[PDB]
Ligand binder design. Structure first.
Ligand code: HEM
Ligand SMILES: CN1C=C(N)C=CC1
Length: 291
């Protein structure tokens, strides 16, 4: 199965910058969502979950086909709460009907990271909607109750190595867990709608206590009112992961650079870009455009 990127007919960088700008203006407007967090975090999670169904062994899933629009994937228990991000993007798709679903969902995540003062994430267009029968079955996204070995095995299905895993997990500074979505509750830190290396700092510097939550699941809780999933905490239990967590806690710039590469890789897994496709786009923030 090969998925060749095909540029939306006649569209260039400026067209996609307009879609980025619409997303970013709506992010700015809808600032009350989820007790004033805004939609940035859920859009990052959306872009990851539409990408994270990929299987390197047969090229099923991944961001290319935009299959999250189909009920089987939209209703995956692993995706509970992402309907909020889908609803946010609907008026954007209405304004730009020519964009593919996979391009829109992935661009949502890129826009969110940059508008939250994160690193620039290069982004490529050309994902093409595929039919309902190409929707991956549920069960391809990761469980949170597991250990470092599980995390490493899981991410190898996505061709991600240790550094890429640790860098991607830093997105868990953003937003929060919600008991009714996932059976976990709480934020990972204080700055949860600005992109920083706080996840790593908190892992290393907080006084964590293993507790059961109100859904009877184990999570690690700090006196500051932060939480970590067992899979997050595993990054300081595994010696290889711990070394990288320390690196990113010490150097936010290095974290930014590694996250940008890993996040682009995640969103492009499964896609063959023809050698004459456009170079990756780097979108200007609203601030950079005076908008
Ligand atoms: C071992 C891998 C991972 C596991 C087990 C995991 C698990 C979870 C869980 C259980 C939630 C809470 C969902 C809810 O209650 O609303 C969550 C939220 C989140 N996840 Fe992850 N995650 C993983 C990796 C990632 C990656 C790779 C990214 C993106 C780079 C990411 C980005 C986020 C974001 C931004 C949120 C907050 C969403 C919001 O505030 O609505 N996660 N994750
Ligand atoms: C520590 N974590 C924080 C989030 N916001 C989501 C998942 C885990």
């Amino acid at each position: 199965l090969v998925h060749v990127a095909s540029v939306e007919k006649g569209r260039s960088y400026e067209d996609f910058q307009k879609v980025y700008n619409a997303i970013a203006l709506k992010l700015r407007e809808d600032d009350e969502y989820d007790n004033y967090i805004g939609y940035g975090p859920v859009l990052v999670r959306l872009a990851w979950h539409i990408s994270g169904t990929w299987d390197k062994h047969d090229n099923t899933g991944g961001s290319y086909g935009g299959t999250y629009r189909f009920k089987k994937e939209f209703n995956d228990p692993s995706n509970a709460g992402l309907q909020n991000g889908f609803k946010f993007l609907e008026p954007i798709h209405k304004e730009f009907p020519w964009i593919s679903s996979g391009d829109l969902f992935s661009l949502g995540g890129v826009t969110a990271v940059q508008e939250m003062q994160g690193p620039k994430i290069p982004w490529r267009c050309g994902r093409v909607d595929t039919p309902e029968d190409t929707t991956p079955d549920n069960g391809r996204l990761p469980d949170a109750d597991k250990d470092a070995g599980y995390v490493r095995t899981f991410f190898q299905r996505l061709n991600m190595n240790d550094r890429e895993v640790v860098a991607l997990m830093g997105a868990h500074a953003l937003g929060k867990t919600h008991l009714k979505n996932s059976g976990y509750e709480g934020p990972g830190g204080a700055a949860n709608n600005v992109f920083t290396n706080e996840f790593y700092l908190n892992l290393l510097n907080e006084d964590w206590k293993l507790e059961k939550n109100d859904a009877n699941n184990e999570q690690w809780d700090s006196k500051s009112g932060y939480m970590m999933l067992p899979t997050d905490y595993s990054l300081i239990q595994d010696p290889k992961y711990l070394s990288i967590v320390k690196e990113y806690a010490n150097d936010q710039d290095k974290f930014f650079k590694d996250f940008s590469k890993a996040f682009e890789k995640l969103l492009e897994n499964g896609i063959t870009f023809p050698k004459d496709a456009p170079s990756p786009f780097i979108f200007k923030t609203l601030e950079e455009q005076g908008l």
